[PDB]
């Protein structure tokens, strides 16, 4: 599972609408040494090197996606849950060639539902840099070319309790493109050092 005692990821999806086409989808555990991907993020130190230290270690995950890119409004929807009432700050960073080219910060208040609190960040428009990048990627003639380009791209999502500034979740995402027969797939991993 992608989560901790305090906050669990319940659903994540990135999609385009004219039904939906889902690039990646998670609906709800091997490990990986941080040092394996250190170079994929910067050392602003707003890439992982400085942030993992501050801790706690159990809040850090790596997700690998095999995206389905064979298919307007481009969106992202995420939903988390917890037993405690918080306000969440969600920082999302896109890193390209070791540099941070996007940072998106959003804030979501708890909603009471069925004896738990849910945090619904629904249909957040995908930022324009990504829509444009996807359009280009979509142009490439071969999948191995898409994957060459994507090896230089990573996303980091940091979720923090806004009122205390405690880190609840830190997730790194890396991407490849699957073949259409093989739909999208993900694998979630713990990060350790
Ligand atoms: O949706 C956005 O605008 C965004 C901005 C910064 C980092 C990630 C973002 N969305 C996104 C898009 C596809 C997969 C994943 Br994980 C996240």
From Swiss-Prot:
UniProt subcellular location: Nucleus
Region (Transcriptional activation) location: 1-193
Chain coiled-coil ranges: none
Subunit structure: Interacts with YAP1 and WWTR1/TAZ.
Known role: Transcription factor which plays a key role in the Hippo signaling pathway, a pathway involved in organ size control and tumor suppression by restricting proliferation and promoting apoptosis. The core of this pathway is composed of a kinase cascade wherein MST1/MST2, in complex with its regulatory protein SAV1, phosphorylates and activates LATS1/2 in complex with its regulatory protein MOB1, which in turn phosphorylates and inactivates YAP1 oncoprotein and WWTR1/TAZ.
Name of the protein: Transcriptional enhancer factor TEF-4
Gene: TEAD2
């Amino acid at each position: 599972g992608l989560g901790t005692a305090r906050l669990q990821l319940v659903e994540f999806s990135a999609f385009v609408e004219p039904q939906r086409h889902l690039f990646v989808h998670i609906s709800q555990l091997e490990s990986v040494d941080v040092r394996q991907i250190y170079d994929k993020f910067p050392e602003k130190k707003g890439g992982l090197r400085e942030l993992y230290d501050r801790g706690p270690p159990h809040a850090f995950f790596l997700v690998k996606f095999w995206a389905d890119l064979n298919w307007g409004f481009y969106g992202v929807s995420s939903q988390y849950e917890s037993l405690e009432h918080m306000t969440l700050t969600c920082s999302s960073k896109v890193c390209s060639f070791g540099k941070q080219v996007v940072e998106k910060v959003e804030t979501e208040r708890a909603q009471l539902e069925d004896g738990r609190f849910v945090y619904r960040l629904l249909r957040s428009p995908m930022c324009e840099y990504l829509v444009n990048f996807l359009h280009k990627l979509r142009q490439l003639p071969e999948r191995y070319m898409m994957n060459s380009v994507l090896e230089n791209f990573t996303i980091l999502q940091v979720v923090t309790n806004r009122d205390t500034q405690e880190l609840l979740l830190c997730t790194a995402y890396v991407f490849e493109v699957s073949t259409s027969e093989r739909g999208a797939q993900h694998h979630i991993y713990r990060l350790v050092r």
